[PDB]
């Protein structure tokens, strides 16, 4: 099956494609937002400015896809 060329989906490794796009961590996956355009993950506390909670919204788009 598929396996990431960067991290081999090894949970002991960082990956800014498979896990948080800003810190590459797998921690707190319930606080990592998925961008509905690029499907990258982002810790609420890695964003700048940071979010205090997961938005109550239908969809969310990351600063890169928003181009701001």
């Amino acid at each position: 099956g598929p396996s990431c060329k960067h991290c081999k989906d090894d949970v002991n490794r960082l990956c800014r494609v498979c896990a948080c796009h800003l810190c590459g961590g797998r921690q707190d996956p319930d606080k990592q937002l998925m961008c509905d355009e690029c499907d990258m993950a982002f810790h609420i506390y890695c964003l700048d400015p940071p979010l205090s909670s997961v938005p109550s919204e239908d969809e969310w788009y990351c600063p890169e896809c928003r181009n701001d």
Binding site: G1, P2, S3, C4, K5, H6, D9, V17, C18, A19, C20, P29, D30, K31, Q32, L33, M34, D36, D39, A41, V54, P55, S56, E57, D58, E59, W60
Partner: peptide
């Protein structure tokens, strides 16, 4: 109510969809 990484990881179909997309991109 946005999707989290945990929501993806817990769903085998969502997880496989994400793996397939990453593999394709890395090609």
């Amino acid at each position: 109510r946005v999707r989290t990484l945990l929501s993806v990881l817990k769903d085998p179909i969502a997880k496989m969809r994400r793996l397939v997309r990453i593999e394709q991109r890395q090609k």
